[model samples]
Target: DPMTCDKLPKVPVPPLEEFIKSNPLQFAYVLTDTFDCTTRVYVQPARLSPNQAATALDIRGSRIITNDFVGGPNNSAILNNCTTGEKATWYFQYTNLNTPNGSSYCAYTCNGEEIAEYKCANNNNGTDPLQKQAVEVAKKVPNGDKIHYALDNCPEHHGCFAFY
Candidate 1:
């Protein structure tokens, strides 16, 4: 299965406090579409509560130094977005895998990738500590207008181009 072939990027997950301290004043997460194009980067509000909604945020600040629009071939795209002081979030979930409870240390190809490397707590208890930590981190930053990712100044449904 293609799913078996797709390996998640292995990186570190630091405690929420340390993560916020070492990085910029923004939440850092990367969103990649199946076409290998990074649909979004520099996702702010570094954390969120499990019960909360996943709001689409904006890509702002000096998060990305280069101006290349479609993203470059460099792995930095993952590193720059996913890493927290060289470690990526170890995402855990309540539903699947060996750790049904959650992984304090935790995808597909066309199905795309799923977040699995972030700290989680109180598995099966219904409270996701990782998300709570994220929520707490989010609280520190003041609210602002968020934006969505686009195919630039072009029509999306027209199929002017293709993405793998």
Candidate 2:
């Protein structure tokens, strides 16, 4: 009962190329806290837009990941549909945060519904772009569900499955 939202261990902002392997969006970075028994965490605005999006998502799932997602056996398609004529929104899914609380998150939607996103501070360093580290997070949801395209949520477009 002593810690506040201002101080969760900050997660490093991973390189953009590294993030695309798991998510094809190229992700327009938008991007917690803890202590005293609260078990919270934090993320940097430079890494994420609306900064707290990822952490908030992570904090929200300490229950579902344990109750429904990993309750026994679960499998679902990782794809969501986006039209070529509009703000193509990526699909949503839930993945585990591998925490003691068994947290889970939807990487695409982790930016939350209210926060603005961020941009790269420095250049990509000119690596193969594809040689970056892989993220363990994956998509979730049945094969037929469709998540609406959200242009406001998006801002990543290089050689991605871009739709705009």
Candidate 3:
């Protein structure tokens, strides 16, 4: 292998949060490498309607992952891990041209199912810091799994609030 040794240029990868903050209304490919485990994450807008809601997870040149409404203020789906122990990633972005009057939050899937539904309140009004919602790392899941987050209601829906 020494005969073909080659030096590669160093590249900087910014944190996902920074990328998300800067890349609003645009798709950010935060995960470029193959992952070892399955993961699902989603953000809920406010009120959700049948036609106003759409969910997708695009794996480059592979299968396009999707989830449906399971039950009780949640959209759930499954992303099977690759047998080769490799995972592909794509930028996830939700677009709602129409404004809604409700609130939103994020959720996660664990141990082959969706659990730990965390709610985040909407600060669209931008007044109460107390109404601001954030997630805390309460615990960890099994060795290998994906935490899928989805919009609680339709991004176009009006007045969807997240409960504590």
Candidate 4:
């Protein structure tokens, strides 16, 4: 799930357009046989619609970035377990930011360490402002140093040479 600066605000920071166009982030992924990744695009009602500050044009973020690619050899796929003979898939999911707290938030597989999640800030909903809001809330989550994500087949996979 590669996040360009397109969805972010243009003010209070370097122009998202310039930042994104000048330094576009790169994310790689791979899908296994069990998961035949298919491209599916859809939109939803703007979560910020209620906010008078925002216009209707701004649609809530849609499209599941994780589903864009299957963990296989089609496009930007990596071999998991480094098993040359056996079938395997490996890949990554990179984003613009990586900070989680009250101001900005993010969600991810805690113990599983299998997937990363994105949460919003400033009442991402543009309504129902509360505390500890849902962990999966969407708001202006702060973006920090970008981290590289790699998903492998074996749950026990760890270290540089998990497999060979």
Candidate 5:
């Protein structure tokens, strides 16, 4: 059944890029709490966009990175679809805060496992980009099921995944 819709003032939703650009994604929500409880996280907008359309999260941040369609059981291609202009999106969260050894945290994931993890170079007098120190957090889904990691970056050590 079709119903006539009333015209109302349109509300503006901030694009994901805006959040990514303005949000402080440092250790604010990525670290564990006193009880060792897992961090609660979420993402908005979308990561995959068409042409110039921005996804839920923007890709313009010094703290994050994305590699499209780069997850598979051994680097295999997880092609959702190829005939209809479908594309893949891979994301990573980076931080400039360095550890004692001078390495920042950097990571990339496919599905729900740590596909790639690394630490950035030394501080180098702070002139260099903040070194991404690789930290260990959870990156696996419970029971090994595939997870849709929405909004947040993959965990470091034990196992962590995302949802839409």
Candidate 6:
């Protein structure tokens, strides 16, 4: 009962210039513990509105030509897991476009790993329009590299890491 910052859970801060020009073939990645081992900011949810296209359960086709370090440092926090069911978010979508102009996705992992590796880039052209129809319904889900998501404020005694 110490995790302060108003209990953190406002969610919806994806506007750093449209979060670096958008990148969502499939979204949802919630890892906590204020990760920032260097310069990798991930606390996703740039969705916008119409939310209802996540049923692949767990799918991670991570494969990014090597060079890791997406986000590190103790990851996993929150009374260390009470009652369970919260640490999950890794939904990359079809994009092996030969890797040329870059188009692979997936953030880091530590407590929930089914697949991990991929976070190259995709020039991410997303200007909205329901986020391009939710990346075309996450590229016709059903196996389209399905789903995942974040945390915040922990200093009033340090214990606010669990926004899953």
The local distance difference test score of each candidate is 0.25, 0.22, 0.25, 0.23, 0.27, 0.26
User: Can you tell me which runs of candidate 4 are displaced by over 4 Å?
Assistant: 1-28, 31-34, 46-92, 95-111, 114-164
Q: Which ten contiguous residues of candidate 2 have the minimum total lDDT? A: 64-73
Task: Give the CA lDDT, 0 to 100, for residue 141 in model 4.
Answer: 26
lDDT of 5: 0.27
Highest-TM-score candidate: 3
Candidate 1 to native Cα RMSD, angstroms: 18.4
Candidate number achieving the greatest lDDT relative to the actual structure: 5
Error of 4 at 32 (Å): 4.4
lDDT tens digits, residue span 1-164, model 6: 21221221222222233433333233322222222111222233226624322111121222111111122123311111113433333322322322334332333222222222222222332222333333333323332243222112322323422111
Stretches off by above 4 angstroms in model 1 are 1-5, 25-58, 61-164
The list of candidate 3 runs beyond 4 A from truth reads: 1-54, 59-63, 73-105, 112-164
Kindly list the per-residue Cα lDDT of model 1 for residues 18-99, writing each as its tens digit: 3222222211222232111222221223255442212122223213221111121322122222222342222222112214
Indicate the worst ten consecutive residues by lDDT in candidate 5.
1-10
The weakest ten consecutive residues by lDDT in model 4 span 52-61
Q: Write the per-residue lDDT of candidate 5 for residues 46-163, one digit (tens) a residue.
A: 4555533332221222232322232334322232322345554323334333335342223333333323221111223223343211221222322212222222443343342221
TM-score of each: 0.20, 0.18, 0.23, 0.16, 0.21, 0.20
lDDT of 2 by residue, 1-164 (tens): 11211211123333322332222122211131111111112222235444222211111213210101111112221221112222212222322232343222333322333211111111222122221211111111221122221223323445633222
lDDT for position 67 in model 2:
9
